[PDB]
Amino acid sequence: AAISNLIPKLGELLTEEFKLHKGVKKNIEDLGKELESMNAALIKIGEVPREQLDSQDKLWADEVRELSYVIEDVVDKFLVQVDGINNKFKGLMKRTTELLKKVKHKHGIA
Amino acid sequence: AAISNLIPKLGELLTEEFKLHKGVKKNIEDLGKELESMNAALIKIGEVPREQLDSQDKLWADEVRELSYVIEDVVDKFLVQVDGINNKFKGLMKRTTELLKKVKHKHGIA
């Protein structure tokens, strides 16, 4: 019965979950590649003889460090968000299911 | 070079993305089933002759409506969260990549 808008709202939730799932998959693929490339660069850089590092290298190292700090803070914001993304939802849906079963039983519906 | 903790932090981000991806997949499967079951129940309930609805049906309908309102508010909280889950991240990583390329070029590394 068209008692409420429960179904569309759950539809909306399912829709955004599909979208989120697909977006995270893209993020994962992109990040895995970026991480692998950056890690490979750092490995080769790590092989440069210390004697060949000069004032420009020091400037670049410090800029890379500063950048890593800012990237961390941004990543932390993502990490915290993911920490939000439930017990109350499950309880409400369970009660709702129980009530629908009562209604069906009352009217001889399996 | 072990200049920074950029790599582990990106590793941590990738790890939580994997976990989030797998969790959303489970949510999607569970919700699709729940939605389908509830929608099927509502269809059969919607076929009950109006003449057979009494005081107990009215009580149950109102409780289902109230429940749908609370479920909506909870779902909205999820929807808003997903709305958070980035331009700044991409700019920082691009600059970081550029600096690593400068370092490699400086030292005759491809």
DSSP string of A37-55?
HHHHHHHHHTTS-GGG--H
Contact A10 B41 (CB under 8 A): no
Contact A24 B24 (CB under 8 A): yes
- Domains of chain B with bracketed CATH: 1-110 (1.20.5.4130)
Q: B54 φ, ψ to 5°?
A: -125, -160
Chain B residues whose beta carbon lies within 8 Å of the beta carbon of residue A17: 24, 27-28, 31, 82
Q: How far is it, in rounded angstroms, from Cα A101 to Cα B4?
A: 59
Chain B residues whose beta carbon lies within 8 Å of the beta carbon of residue A64: 3-4, 6, 96, 99-100
Of A43, A69, A48, nearest to A58 (Cα)?
A: A48
Question: Within an 8 Å CB–CB cutoff, is residue B4 touching chain A?
Answer: yes
Residue A110: C-alpha distances to residues A98, B36, B62 (Å): 13, 16, 22
C-beta atoms surrounding A37 within 10 Å: 12
Contact A9 B71 (CB under 8 A): yes
Contact B10 A106 (CB under 8 A): no
Which amino acid type is present at position A48?
Answer: V
Of A90, A92, A16, A97, nearest to B76 (Cα)?
A: A16
Question: Within an 8 Å CB–CB cutoff, is residue A97 touching chain B?
Answer: yes
Q: Would you say A98 and B67 are in contact if contact means Cβ atoms under 8 Å apart? A: no
Q: Is A42 exposed, middle or buried (0-12, 13-18, 19+ CB in 10 A)?
A: buried
Method of determination is: X-ray
